[PDB]
Amino acid sequence: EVETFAFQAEIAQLMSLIINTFYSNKEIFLRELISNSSDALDKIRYESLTDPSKLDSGKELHINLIPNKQDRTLTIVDTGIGMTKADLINNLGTIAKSGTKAFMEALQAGADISMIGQFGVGFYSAYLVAEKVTVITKHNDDEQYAWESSAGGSFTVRTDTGEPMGRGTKVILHLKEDQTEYLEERRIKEIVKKHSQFIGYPITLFVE
Amino acid sequence: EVETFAFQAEIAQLMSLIINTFYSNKEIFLRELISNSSDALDKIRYESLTDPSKLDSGKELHINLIPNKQDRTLTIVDTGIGMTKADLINNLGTIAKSGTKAFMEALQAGADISMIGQFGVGFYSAYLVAEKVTVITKHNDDEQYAWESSAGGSFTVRTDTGEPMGRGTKVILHLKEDQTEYLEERRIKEIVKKHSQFIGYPITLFVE
Ligand SMILES: COC(=O)Cc1cc(O)cc(O)c1
Ligand SMILES: COC(=O)Cc1cc(O)cc(O)c1
């Protein structure tokens, strides 16, 4: 059973802007996704301070980057707090309608697409490099769900029967044919060193 | 009835570092506090997306800056989500023990005190300019509380019987004798324009 939802018009507009604007500095999507993983990891750490049972679903707090040249995918996995079905549907827990508004204005008023994360919608920067994005997530309060979208105004949500993940979020980027540089080890290491060097959780880049 | 608590040793160490390190670029405390107000405002906005009653305690989402030269105070008030008593005690809702660890290392490894906010402990940057900080807060789930500390290893928490605030947080900075520039209108406007120009909520600077 797959449920199909329409994006709110402001989110569709944000996505169309990300996809259509000429903008060379696409590598910033990786910093925005690691930053989102780091924020989700902070959340579960904080809840665990007063309730250690919150980590029964996994004690390890970390971020893995997994390139796969065969499937043309780059996957980011974190063991953060995860997202409930309701959060997934409501723009992956963001206040994306009001963030889009602030970001749109900043763009006319001198900002550029790399500052997206200052408006709380950095997740959508995945569409600088991906034709399709799949998000698998498990929150302590809910079942494991898979969200997916190739943009074009809609997204789907289903229960995920794939590998159980315990707790956290996996973002699977199905890369555009011309954006395979982001599966190269040297290129990923360069971006992580450039933009993500003070993230507080181990980032492991997997080998192929 | 005033309850007095000891800071965790890592937080006392972070505060001692903030207070004792020679570091001229003190103006960054204002950006860190506005950023914290903006994050608290995002939280209440998100909860209100699925439960509008969450805003019965006040619909307006904003940040006021209130200088008072007579009391030598700069107060930042937001109508964000506020903090429960438990959050106030547990380092004002931060994961400050693990943030301090990451920040300490970044400092030996080339970072400087202005990057504090990248470690989730920007609140403590108030001690670049304040001898004493009072935080009054009201969360929908709790009573209004006042937290206070002049550093030196302890902080107090009491029920606040002062002006009811509805919902949100007020940070009252009792400025060091030599840091009164931060009560001057021209100086505040300059810092807000420099560091806080893409905050998504109206910031009103009050006149004396
Ligand atoms: C801000 O949260 C989001 O946009 C969802 C999100 C969660 C996560 O753990 C990783 C991500 O890349 C995105
Ligand atoms: C991250 O949250 C805190 O450190 C508490 C905090 C909340 C707030 O609304 C304003 C602040 O300046 C600080």
What does the H/E/C string look like for A107-160? HHCCCCHHHHHHHCCHHHHHHHCEEEEEEEEECCCCCCEEEEECCCCEEEEEEC
Q: Give me the phi and psi of B73, to 5 degrees please.
A: -125, 145
Any residues with CB less than 8 A from the CB of B133 and at least 6 apart, and which? B126, B127, B148, B149, B171, B172, B173, B174
Q: How many CA atoms lie within 13 A of A112 on its CB side?
A: 7
| Closest by CA position to A159, among listed A172, A173, A142 | A142
List of long-range contacts for A113-117, beta carbons under 8 Å, 24+ apart: A113/A18, A113/A21, A113/A23, A113/A25, A113/A28, A114/A25, A114/A28, A115/B198, A116/A18, A116/A28, A116/A32, A117/A28, A117/A31, A117/A32, A117/A35
Longest Cα–Cα distance in chain B: 47
Sign of torsion over alpha carbons B118, B12, B165, B47: positive
| Closest by CA position to B136, among listed B86, B85, B170, B109 | B170
Other C-beta atoms closer than 10 Å to the C-beta of B70 total 7
Nearest Cα residue in chain B from A42: B95
Q: Which ligand has the nearest atom to the CA of A136?
A: 1
Question: CA-CA distance, B137 to B164, in Å (whole number)?
Answer: 10
Q: Does B50 touch chain A (CB under 8 A)?
A: yes
How many helices and strands in chain A, by DSSP H and E?
Answer: 5, 8
Q: Determine the angle formed by the axes of helices B185-195 and B28-50, rounding to 10 degrees.
A: 60
Whole-number Å distance, alpha carbon B14 to ligand 1 midpoint, is 29
Q: Does A50 touch chain B (CB under 8 A)?
A: yes
Any residues with CB less than 8 A from the CB of A31 and at least 6 apart, and which? A117, A191, A195, A196
Rg of chain A (C-alpha set) = 16
Whole-number Å distance, alpha carbon B92 to ligand 2 midpoint, is 7
Residue A104 identity (one-letter amino acid): M
Any residues with CB less than 8 A from the CB of A124 and at least 6 apart, and which? A11, A14, A15, A18, A96, A116
- Mapped onto helix, strand or coil, the DSSP state of residue B207 is coil
- Alpha carbon A58 to chain centroid distance? 20
What six digits make up the tokens of B72? 């030598």
| Closest by CA position to A99, among listed A76, A74, A124 | A124
Pair A137, A88: CB distance under 8 Å: yes
Sign of torsion over alpha carbons B43, B45, B47, B53: positive
Nearest Cα residue in chain B from A39: B120
Whole-number Å distance, alpha carbon B75 to ligand 2 midpoint, is 13
Pair A23, A112: CB distance under 8 Å: yes
What six digits make up the tokens of A63? 């971020």
- Ligand 2 atom with the shortest distance to the CA of B120: 1
Question: CA-CA distance, B108 to B105, in Å (whole number)?
Answer: 5
Q: How many CA atoms lie within 13 A of B52 on its CB side?
A: 0
**Sheet hosting strand B63-68, strand order edge to edge:** B3-6, B154-159, B145-149, B130-138, B168-175, B73-78, B63-68, B203-205
CATH code for the domain in which residue B26 is found: 3.30.565.10
Question: CA-CA distance, B100 to B11, in Å (whole number)?
Answer: 7
Q: Do the chains contact at A198 and B119, CB–CB below 8 Å? A: yes
Mutate: best of B49, B92, B108, partner A, most A CBs <10 A: B49
Print burial letters for B109-132: b (CB count within 10 Å at least 16), e (below 16): eebebbebbbbbbbbbbbbbbbeb
Q: Which residues line ligand 2 (CB under 6 A)?
A: B 33, 36-37, 40, 78, 80, 92-94, 123, 169, 171
Secondary structure letter of residue A83 according to DSSP: -
Question: CA-CA distance, A7 to A16, in Å (whole number)?
Answer: 11
Q: Give me the phi and psi of A58, to 5 degrees please.
A: 150, 125
Residue A160 identity (one-letter amino acid): D
What six digits make up the tokens of B113? 């005190």
| Residue B125 to residues A27, A113, A136, B16, Cα–Cα distance (Å) | 31, 29, 37, 11
- Going by alpha carbons, the residue nearest to atom 13 of ligand 1 is A36
List of long-range contacts for A110-118, beta carbons under 8 Å, 24+ apart: A111/B198, A112/A23, A112/A25, A113/A18, A113/A21, A113/A23, A113/A25, A113/A28, A114/A25, A114/A28, A115/B198, A116/A18, A116/A28, A116/A32, A117/A28, A117/A31, A117/A32, A117/A35, A118/B198
Q: Which chain B residues are closer than 8 Å to A45 by Cβ?
A: 95, 98
Task: Classify strands A168-175 and B203-205 as parallel, antiparallel or unpaired.
Answer: unpaired
Please tell me what resolution, in angstroms, this structure has: 1.9
* Cross-strand partners of A169: A78, A137
Pair B169, B135: CB distance under 8 Å: yes
Whole-number Å distance, alpha carbon A25 to ligand 1 midpoint, is 21
- Mapped onto helix, strand or coil, the DSSP state of residue A66 is strand
Query: What string of DSSP letters covers A24-49?
Result: S-TTHHHHHHHHHHHHHHHHHHHHHH
| Closest by CA position to B138, among listed B78, B65, B60 | B78
Q: A74 vs chain B: nearest CA distance in angstroms?
A: 26
Q: Which chain B residues are closer than 8 Å to A99 by Cβ?
A: 200
Number of domains in chain A: 1
Q: Determine the angle formed by the axes of helices B96-108 and B9-20, rounding to 10 degrees.
A: 40
Sign of torsion over alpha carbons B117, B121, B124, B126: positive
Question: CA-CA distance, B98 to A77, in Å (whole number)?
Answer: 21
Domain of A185 in residue numbering reads as: 1-208
Rg of chain B (C-alpha set) = 16
| Residue B170 to residues B36, B56, B83, B136, B139, Cα–Cα distance (Å) | 11, 19, 11, 5, 12
Pair B121, B13: CB distance under 8 Å: no
Pair A182, A126: CB distance under 8 Å: no
